[PDB]
Structure 1
Amino acid sequence: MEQAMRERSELARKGIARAKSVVALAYAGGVLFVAENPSRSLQKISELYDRVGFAAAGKFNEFDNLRRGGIQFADTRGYAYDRRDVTGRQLANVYAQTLGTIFTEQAKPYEVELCVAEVAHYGETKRPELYRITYDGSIADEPHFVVMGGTTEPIANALKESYAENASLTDALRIAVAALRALGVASLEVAVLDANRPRRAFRRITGSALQALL
């Protein structure tokens, strides 16, 4: 089966490489999500829980399934225990377990790459956390940024070059959009995990407001 898993890995890798790109960056404000997205209504960035966000690249129906699954998991846990007990690390761990099971047992692997991010609770000091989960369930935490989908090399290099820790929202956005180029309101999906919010940190930046930061 050496070739079996070999072929499954190829199929997924190709699908993802063929998809549009997404980046997540840590900034003084919180965490910033920027994705190439032409669609008006189909989303690749999403809230999961109070301080936890989600971004994906690849086949939409597949990462949307995982998005819903994550929300289900997060809401279920917060109710069985408490809201404060749900963490981005817990969600990343469950996505790893899930993709791993999908990768080896599903008829076809999921052609997706996920990012789970978490910011501090209101009034706390805690470095943002970024987790990247790939199609085979491999998982990695990143300190500063995550790039997914399409040809990531140029984008990651551009970030590795221009990325500054604790940049403002505007500077972070510009850095991100530029790295992505390696773009206007109509082709971008933007949102942040705003650590300054009391409970729900996730907020989308759209239309005029998004224009203002460009």
Structure 2
Amino acid sequence: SPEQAMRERSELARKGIARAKSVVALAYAGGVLFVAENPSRSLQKISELYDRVGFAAAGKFNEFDNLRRGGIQFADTRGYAYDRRDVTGRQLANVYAQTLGTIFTEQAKPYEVELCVAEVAHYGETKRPELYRITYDGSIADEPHFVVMGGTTEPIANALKESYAENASLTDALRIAVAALRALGVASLEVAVLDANRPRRAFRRITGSALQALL
């Protein structure tokens, strides 16, 4: 009976993600903001993939770390084979959806992860940021405003469905997301942005007293 097996694998994966912590991504005036609860400075939940593409994940660390390494390898090979400007976040989201669907179907235990891919416009260009959410079974959805993954997402999703303001500042957006995650100081928080104003590499981490000032 395929339907029973599919239901059980889905239930296992959704229990796995339900016991994890929450990471939220928000589109603001200068790009995309990543905020996650991470009491460890050594195991990171947010990373960069290419010049204007960002990575975020929730769930089991080793599974999405393997996924992040594979995505970096794919992006580097594609950029070297064709050229740098020919690498977009849509291709990465598609390749992630294919590999997660294959893992869900063929492997003994599915991956208990939820992924998000973010892209920003190139330097000196005006384009709305894109957020893609990839689910454990391979479903891919395109989100215009924000993505919430991990833990209990309904209260955070409501606290962000209200009070979200387009073209907000970095400080206001950071405060808003920090408020929404409670439905946390410099420690236990991992924060990164994709800065559209940067010439080539848009990814940078906000750590230490610089993060303290903006809170």
With normalisation by structure 1, the TM-score equals 0.99
For 2:135 and 2:176, how far apart are their aligned partners in 1? 24
Task: Give 1:59 deviation, angstroms.
Answer: 0.4
Q: Deviations over 1:80-124 (max 9, x none)?
A: 111111101111011000100011111110000000000000110
Task: Give 1:40 deviation, angstroms.
Answer: 1.1
For 2:141 and 2:167, how far apart are their aligned partners in 1? 21
Task: Give 1:5 deviation, angstroms.
Answer: 1.1
Does residue 206 in structure 1 map to residue 199 in structure 2? no
SS at match of 1:25: strand
SS at match of 1:97: helix
Q: Deviations over 1:110-151 (max 9, x none)?
A: 000000000000110000000000100100010010000000
Task: Give 1:166 deviation, angstroms.
Answer: 1.1
- Percent sequence identity over aligned pairs: 100
> Which position in structure 2 is the counterpart of 1:62?
63
> Which position in structure 2 is the counterpart of 1:49?
50
For 2:208 and 2:4, how far apart are their aligned partners in 1? 47
SS at match of 2:125: coil
For 2:11 and 2:191, how far apart are their aligned partners in 1? 30
For 2:159 and 2:144, how far apart are their aligned partners in 1? 16
Aligned pairs, how many?
Answer: 213
For 1:3 and 1:185, how far apart are their aligned partners in 2? 45
Q: CA RMSD in A?
A: 0.5
Does residue 148 in structure 1 map to residue 164 in structure 2? no
Task: Give 1:41 deviation, angstroms.
Answer: 0.8
For 2:125 and 2:104, how far apart are their aligned partners in 1? 37
For 1:103 and 1:209, how far apart are their aligned partners in 2? 41
Q: Deviations over 1:178-198 (max 9, x none)?
A: 111111110100000000000
For 2:125 and 2:28, how far apart are their aligned partners in 1? 15
SS at match of 1:123: coil
Q: Deviations over 1:24-71 (max 9, x none)?
A: 000001000000111111001000000000000000001111111110
For 2:142 and 2:25, how far apart are their aligned partners in 1? 12
For 1:176 and 1:164, how far apart are their aligned partners in 2? 11
For 2:186 and 2:104, how far apart are their aligned partners in 1? 35
SS at match of 1:187: coil
Unaligned 5+ segments in structure 1 are: none
Task: Give 1:17 deviation, angstroms.
Answer: 0.8
Task: Give 1:161 deviation, angstroms.
Answer: 0.5
Task: Give 1:16 deviation, angstroms.
Answer: 0.5
Unaligned 5+ segments in structure 2 are: none
For 1:24 and 1:91, how far apart are their aligned partners in 2? 17
For 1:31 and 1:154, how far apart are their aligned partners in 2? 21
